[PDB]
Amino acid sequence: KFPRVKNWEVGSITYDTLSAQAQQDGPCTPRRCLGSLVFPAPEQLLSQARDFINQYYSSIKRSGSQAHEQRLQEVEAEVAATGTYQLRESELVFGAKQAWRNAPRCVGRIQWGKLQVFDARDCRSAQEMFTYICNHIKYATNRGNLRSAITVFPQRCPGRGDFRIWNSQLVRYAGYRQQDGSVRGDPANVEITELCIQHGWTPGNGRFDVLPLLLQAPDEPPELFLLPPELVLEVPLEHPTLEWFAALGLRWYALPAVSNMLLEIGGLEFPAAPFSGWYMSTEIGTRNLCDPHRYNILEDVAVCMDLDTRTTSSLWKDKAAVEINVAVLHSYQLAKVTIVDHHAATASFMKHLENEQKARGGCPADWAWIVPPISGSLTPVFHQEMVNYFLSPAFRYQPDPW
Ligand X SMILES: C[C@H](O)[C@H](O)[C@H]1CNc2nc(N)[nH]c(=O)c2N1
Ligand Y SMILES: Cc1cc(N)nc2cc(CNCCc3ccc(C#N)cc3)ccc12
Residues that bind Gd ion (CB under 5 A): 241
375 binds a second copy (CB under 8 A): yes
Q: Tell me which of Zn ion, Gd ion, ligand X, none is bound by residue 385, counting a contact when its beta carbon lies within the kind-specific cut-off of 5 to 8 angstroms.
A: ligand X
At its nearest, how many Å lie between ligand HEM and the CB of residue 55?
17
- Strand residue runs (E) in 84-233: 116-119, 149-152, 164-165, 175-177, 183-185, 213-216, 223-225
Q: Report the 10 Å Cβ neighbour count for 169.
A: 19
Taking contact as CB under 6 A, which single stretch among the options 88-96, 122-130, 279-287, 320-328 is the one that binds ligand Y? 279-287
Instruction: Give the span between the Cα atoms of 14 and 19, in whole angstroms.
Output: 12
Active-site residue, from 283, 294, 299, 304: 283
193 binds a second copy (CB under 8 A): no
End-to-end CA distance of the chain: 45
Active site includes 283? yes
368 binds ligand X (CB under 6 A): yes
Radius of gyration of the chain (CA): 23
Instruction: Give the span between the Cα atoms of 391 and 398, in whole angstroms.
Output: 17
Please check whether residue 220 is in contact with residue 126, taking contact to mean a CB–CB distance below 8 angstroms: yes
At its nearest, how many Å lie between ligand X and the CB of residue 334?
25
Within residues 167-226, the interface with Zn ion by CB under 5 A covers none
Active site includes 106? yes
Please check whether residue 381 is in contact with residue 371, taking contact to mean a CB–CB distance below 8 angstroms: yes
Within residues 77-136, the interface with ligand HEM by CB under 6 A covers 100, 103, 105-108, 111, 115
Phi, psi of 354 (to 5 degrees): -65, -50
Active site includes 123? no
382 binds ligand X (CB under 6 A): yes
At 251, which helix (H) or strand (E)? Answer: strand 251-253
Taking contact as CB under 5 A, which single stretch among the options 22-30, 286-294, 311-319, 340-348 is the one that binds Zn ion? 22-30
Q: Which of 227, 251, 235 is nearest to 338 (CA)?
A: 235
**397 labelled ligand-binding:** yes
Taking contact as CB under 8 A, which single stretch among the options 73-81, 219-227, 245-253, 292-300 is the one that binds a second copy? 292-300
- Strand residue runs (E) in 266-332: 268-270, 275-276
Give me the helix-helix angle, 42-59 and 89-101, nearest 10°. 90
At its nearest, how many Å lie between Gd ion and the CB of residue 243?
5
Active site includes 109? yes
271 binds ligand HEM (CB under 6 A): no
182 binds a second copy (CB under 8 A): no
At its nearest, how many Å lie between a second copy and the CB of residue 63?
25
Distance (Å) of CA 46 to CA 96, 265, 393? 19, 12, 14
Instruction: Give the span between the Cα atoms of 134 and 257, in whole angstroms.
Output: 12
Residue 248 CB contacts under 8 Å (≥ 6 apart), including other chains: 237, 297, 300, 301
26 binds Zn ion (CB under 5 A): no
Give me the helix-helix angle, 42-59 and 67-82, nearest 10°. 160
Residues of this chain that interact with ligand X (CB under 6 A) are: 8, 36, 38, 105, 368-369, 382-385
Binding residues: 28, 33, 36, 106, 169, 278-279, 283, 287-288, 368-369, 382, 397
Residues of this chain that interact with ligand HEM (CB under 6 A) are: 100, 103, 105-108, 111, 115, 148, 150, 275, 277-278, 280, 283, 340, 345, 369, 395
Residues of this chain that interact with ligand Y (CB under 6 A) are: 38, 256, 258, 275-280, 283
Residues of this chain that interact with a second copy (CB under 8 A) are: 3, 5-6, 8-10, 16, 19-20, 22-23, 25-26, 28-38, 281, 286-287, 290-293, 298, 312-315, 317-319, 321-322, 325-326, 329, 333, 341, 343-344, 347, 366-368, 371, 373-378, 382-383, 385-389
